[PDB]
Amino acid sequence: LSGAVTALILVIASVIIALVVVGFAFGLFGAFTGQGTVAQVGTATLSASTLTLTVTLKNTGASTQVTGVLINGNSGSVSGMTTISAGVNTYTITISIGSISTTLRGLVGSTISLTLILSNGETVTVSAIVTS
Template identity: 50%
Template sequence: MLLRRKAKKGLSGAVTALILVIASVIIALVVVGFAFGLFGAFGGTPTVTQVGTGYIYVSKGYAVITLKSSGNVQILSATISGTSYSAGTSSINVTTLTAGINVVSIGFSTSALSSLQTGSTYTISIALSDGSTVQVSVIAQ
């Protein structure tokens, strides 16, 4: 009586090893990418901070501030804290902050700003499209 051998089905050892090596390399690249922030789109909401000193020009009716952003986000409005003085997007020259340094000019009514004291420091609250608010300091000139 002759015995027949069943044919082996499946992947060879070499093919399996190759697949595991490729998968390991891909996983390592993804981990390194996240560790070094290469996948910024998946990094959550951008961080916005003030750079340097901001100024509010009382007689001219506008403030100039420099903001650093880690990604794209829109400015919705700006309000001088402790007052009712606010500015909407039509009064802001840069409404979309991009990654990097952004110089922003915010227009206010000159009559509203006339009550501000020259040389004093004020805080402007900037509302962003991601729901956060950034507090920036400005010196009245």
């Protein structure tokens, strides 16, 4: 008599745990699909004199914050417009690095490769032209 009731209790507990696991697995699918992506879609303009970067970055997911920016050398924080809206938009971003200041004078008119770190863990690689 004691065995069967325990069997039913164990069956119910196993069903409950299985349903929780399945629900969490589907939640992972949804969350990972909706995490958010950012990638370059067109050539970006970078102002060498003022260290201002104008970039066009698409977003097919949730809003993402631009935590940091890095170059082939030193990496510096963003000055303005940290937030990235969903969809394709034109962003005005100022880069403030002590070492990079007054070092792009000779490179005006030639392409430069940059990386835009994102808060959600994604990484953005952009190629841009620099102008005075």
